[PDB]
Amino acid sequence: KSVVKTSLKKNELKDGATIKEKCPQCGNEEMNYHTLATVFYTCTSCGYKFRTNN
Amino acid sequence: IFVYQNNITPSAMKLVPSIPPATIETFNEAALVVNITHHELVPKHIRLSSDEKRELLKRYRLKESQLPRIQRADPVALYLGLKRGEVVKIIRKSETSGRYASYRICM
Amino acid sequence: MDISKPVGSEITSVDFGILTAKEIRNLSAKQITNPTVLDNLGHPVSGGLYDLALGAFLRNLCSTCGLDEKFCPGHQGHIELPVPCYNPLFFNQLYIYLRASCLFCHHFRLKSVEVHRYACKLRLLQYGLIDESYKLDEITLSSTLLNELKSKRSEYVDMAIAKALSDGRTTERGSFTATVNDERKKLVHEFHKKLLSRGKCDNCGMFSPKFRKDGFTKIFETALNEKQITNNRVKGFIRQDSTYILSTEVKNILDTVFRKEQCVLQYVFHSRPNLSRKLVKADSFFMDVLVVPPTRFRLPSKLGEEVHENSQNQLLSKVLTTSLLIRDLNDDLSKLQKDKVSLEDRRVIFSRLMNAFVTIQNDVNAFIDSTKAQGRTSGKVPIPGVKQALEKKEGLFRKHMMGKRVNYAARSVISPDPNIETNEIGVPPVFAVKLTYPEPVTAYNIAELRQAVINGPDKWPGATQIQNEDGSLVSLIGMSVEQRKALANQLLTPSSNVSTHTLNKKVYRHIKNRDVVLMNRQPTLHKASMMGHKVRVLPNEKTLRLHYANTGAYNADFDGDEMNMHFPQNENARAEALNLANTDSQYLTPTSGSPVRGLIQDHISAGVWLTSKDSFFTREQYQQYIYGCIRPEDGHTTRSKIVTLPPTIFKPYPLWTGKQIITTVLLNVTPPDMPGINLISKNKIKNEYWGKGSLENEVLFKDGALLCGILDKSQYGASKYGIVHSLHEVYGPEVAAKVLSVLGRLFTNYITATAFTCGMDDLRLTAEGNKWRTDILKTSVDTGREAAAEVTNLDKDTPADDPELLKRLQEILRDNNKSGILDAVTSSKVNAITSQVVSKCVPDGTMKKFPCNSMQAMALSGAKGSNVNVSQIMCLLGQQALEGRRVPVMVSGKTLPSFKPYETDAMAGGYVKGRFYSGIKPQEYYFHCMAGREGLIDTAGYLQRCLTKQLEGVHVSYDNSIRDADGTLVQFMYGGDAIDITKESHMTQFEFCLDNYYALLKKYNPSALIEHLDVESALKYSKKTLKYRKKHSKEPHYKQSVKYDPVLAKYNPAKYLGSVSENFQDKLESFLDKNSKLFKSSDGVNEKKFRALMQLKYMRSLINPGEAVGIIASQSVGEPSTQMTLNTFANVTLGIPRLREIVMTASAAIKTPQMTLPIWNDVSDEQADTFCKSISKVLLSEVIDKVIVTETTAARSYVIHMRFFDNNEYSEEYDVSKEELQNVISNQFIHLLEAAIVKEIKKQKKVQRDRQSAIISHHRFITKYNFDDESGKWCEFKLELAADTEKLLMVNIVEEICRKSIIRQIPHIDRCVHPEPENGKRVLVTEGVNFQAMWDQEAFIDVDGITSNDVAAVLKTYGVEAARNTIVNEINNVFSRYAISVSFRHLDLIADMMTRQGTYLAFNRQGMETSTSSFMKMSYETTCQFLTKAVLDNEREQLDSPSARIVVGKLNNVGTGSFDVL
Amino acid sequence: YQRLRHMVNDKFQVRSTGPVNSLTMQPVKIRVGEMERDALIGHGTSFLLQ
């Protein structure tokens, strides 16, 4: 009944800008990431993740 | 072996210890609408002969109780109708290793 | 300690007893009768606490032993008690039996028939026959009959026991374990349950009067009720042939009852078959004496010049004061004549008795347990008692035993040096002077020792003191040269005294380089945090000096944080460190087997330039550096004369390059006899950086020479399958240990030549880079506005000034959710922006390029930082984020006073277009300050402690079974493989192992091994089984032929060649299948030769026996948790809390159980989506459009109109039939509706018409019903109440109801949700757990793939095994989300551990409770509670656990004990 | 630049032996806590822990 968008589909879920990242799992060249300097990584292809504190 | 539909009188439940050595069983219809022995988390189970048993102890030089225990109320145990003191072959599939044998003692 | 003082005697076990006043009197050295402390001369007041009998006091000498204060061990006497005192600890168990017995027959009020059977079953379990205890109750056939059966009990018991004593299943000591310990707890507890459940005496039918105790130990005896006196007297003929009960009174009662009941309680309080054959006595309960510790422990105290009496000595006084006054009050009792005592005079003496008793009974508590004691004068604090002394802080076990102050150690700051050896440590001379070692005088070292003696104390290396054979200690400190000189001449002089002729003098020398020490850094989260290291005194620096690569081990940043030197005093301890925990053996992560050490920073920063194609060198250069690092004066000579490479380029001019160096490096470090490595790998750099057509990303070694690739952390850093990992694998660590150690020295040398630096120029773009950087940032203008219009569902071109637009925003601003919803949308778009500036400008737009650009080179080479840093500091910081949100808005609708309300700009929402280089606007700046404040607030073990404690006894035995110290089996094979975690790595690396085979052949050396091995049966048997599995391949698990067992199961792998995990077996075959081409291209190495060989490695890879994995498993888990301190943003509980639920709680109901539902493939998404709604839970409050109620006033009436939505809609939405909607209200809603209104009031002081008729009938206040039977749009009806009734608020009462409505709920099922098809898996996610209900949905869903977090219910429904499997899965998923790898072996170990009872066991008091091992239960929580039950059962502790070993300071049982000296 | 005063006492402390506790016959106020003790166990080094 509301006039605005309260709902979410799958593709809008892209989180953070993308940077060129070699996926240590699938060898993808792109992984999304977030920070804490603790740097997350998330594969674009297989969705594989890892984090980097260093 | 008997199949009740749902309910049993608790006094009839005391006709359960009626007639050793022979044993008596009454099971739930609904509970049996699904096989537990087929589930991707359910390992296989096989009862053991006493000689196998006496060897295995001798083989590991172990007491009865030193072994891994399984409780008798287990539906699985109930599913094989196993008496206390019995031990059963157990096949676990390791993810690292392959099929991995093991054992538990009916308690 | 002195090893010249050997002790043959040995302490095997400890037993428990209660000290009886009798022996106490026998073993007392004195009684202390006087509350007075000391005379004015300070001498002990006679009959006072400090008497010299208990020991010497000050300069006085002991009365008892006559000894000085030095040699007097002390002595302790007693204090006689005029009144028996309830022992406050026992007071509960003691009070328990009081109610149970019948005061008349002096038996327990239950029939002795039942009393006989337990003791039989008890008797069975002292010898440990568990199922036999089930055989007993199986026998059943008037007092006559009661005799034959209970007699027939005994014969069967002894028969089975004699049968059990025939063989060795149990011996005269009985048999006791955990499953043994189980029922002993269960019965006796439930046995005691029946003690309080028996109303009338089954023996005499009499009624004994009730008793009422206090916490202060005062038991008041409640009088008999008349109906008891009624029945007592009626039975009073049948036996023919609220007031304090005194301590003495209660005693004499059970004295009979004990004489009565001895036979049964004989088994109750004896943990084991009692060979001593002692009889239970009530004396051990009460306290008729008080023993006072020796004066020395009770000596007074002080903070300084002000001296303070010992507090317990005060608690000693009040007992002596209260006693003498009572002992004097008793003097009036006997003088009071029984013919002078009137009937009321009995009460004043009773007023004296109860008075006297409470005080002296309160002193018992106040002395022992102040919690059991009455407070004093409302203040002054409770004086610490002995009970309060035990649990102090962590408890005396934990505070002063489980940890201790120690000697021979120091604490100081550390500082980096590359120059030492990584296994070494820098030593300032200050410590060198102090720390010494008990040098045994020998033949070989004689001259040396003389020198330190000559050196004496203060000349390094010094000799501080000397012990002769007599033990006489000689301090050279005040001793001159010639004084020492003659002594030096005297050191080797023979032994005059006989008893010392087998003894020699010993020396204390300053530490020298040959020595090793032990380091630790607190806190210690894993074993590597403590290591031993070689020693070099460093002249003139005042602090310890450490090498870099060691830092990661101790995880030290050189913050100035201080660590701990440790200097073992004997060679064994010295030996243990050197060859085990020292350095090398630790090289891999116990968890993951991953490289834990390596070069850091500048080192990595260096390698790039050296490996450059621009590296060129003169012979002079070339030679120096080579020798510069190597130092053949080390022990590291492979070849005495230094061996070198020729220059790459002879003419016109001689030249070397950087690569050749590393080869030369390998050249003289590597064993000459053995060939060099061949290795294929890569680096972290793309070849394109260097130019067009470089291969340098690939790394290649051949003949142990460097033919391609630049060095990297991916190589000589910590990385799996790096050269360093490789050389560790191939040659062994000691090589690699040197190998790493060389590099730093070399690189350091190299730095000193060309050095390195950063620059301002480094951070400049070219002109176009900025020109670019403008362009994308320019387009960003209207981004925000567009994001709004879509969310608002407005046209994209809607100008930001539209009121409706502005209105909806304010509307949106009101919602929490919609706000967060807005952000992510905005979040998404701007992210893409960001992904453009950086992608274009770095590296292509930089003024300096790699490799000259040091800022890039550091990040690129992963030396430090990532593209993120440089990118954000050069391209821009992009949009800020706060916990997955934008900046919270002031309720004004303004982000910030610089912004008008409801602005569309992302910058207005925290989108940072600046870069640290070009500076940031204040608004921008003020934002980032918030983001900074995050982690701080965010930054603002106890778990793991629990784990380790319970897991101490975990160890490997030789049989490869995993055992506790009691030998209980856990895992038949360790990991189902038994492969060590460390060696595990290269097993699956075949191609590497294919190469190097000859060298690989060198290391393993199959030659000598043949004598000890069967080469056949496994292989024969294996291939046999292989066929079956091949034959049986595709059938499901329960169909699998059980004929042939895993080869490992039939064969000790250590004993037999070929006993193998089939996966490994299979992979090998899969490998050998396609890789056969290599054996052609090979050197002639035969697949057979290869197949056979690899098997060896596998069998070489077996874990050692006696390894304690539990600790290794313990640290493996608790330690990495620290990094989970933060979290990102299903939605289950995460981090430690989710963990704690699993391990800590073993929670029955977790907050968020989720059934995992896979479905059949044939079903479409719609149908499931449809189906999802079906099983989903519905509520009335959901479907209600609006409610309108009307009240009027002949009576107080209420007309109630409800408006719903369009029938189809929710009928589509929530899958609703108006009939239910009708029926639901038609039944449950109404019944609820008039219901509360009554309480509310009470608080104040055609067919429709027929359908309308029934409800009105069943329910009082309904005068009308109506509903919309077509559109369903509304329901409406009328109610009425008494006219006089004052106003009620209808809306809210009704408001409450519909939210409590249940239009259609599911059996323990709440919401189902369809997630995304991860990993090609098609599943539904739910909350709540019911298997049965789901078992009907099978058309949509396969059953066998259903999983849940509910594991208890799984255990409930499916039993233990499957449940265990889930346990692992979940726990993994934790670290999985955190991307943290852990050996499943740890997990399975943890898994199989909690399942050993087939039940689901946390780690806590409960999980620990079952421990046969006691002291471990003691030091854990409560020193007293467990302590009680121990003496109650009179347990002998077998000294299995390390904890106990520590308690007595004893050797590992276990750790070395698996090994035996001969 | 600027020079912090000590927030920490850089002073080391070193004891081979010395005066001991009267209660426990132990070194009076280095303390080796539980987890410290716990490490040797994973190493399996008994006589060190002894």
Ligand SMILES: [Zn+2]
């Ligand atoms: Zn990935």
Ligand SMILES: [Zn+2]
């Ligand atoms: Zn003495």
Ligand SMILES: [Zn+2]
């Ligand atoms: Zn009685």
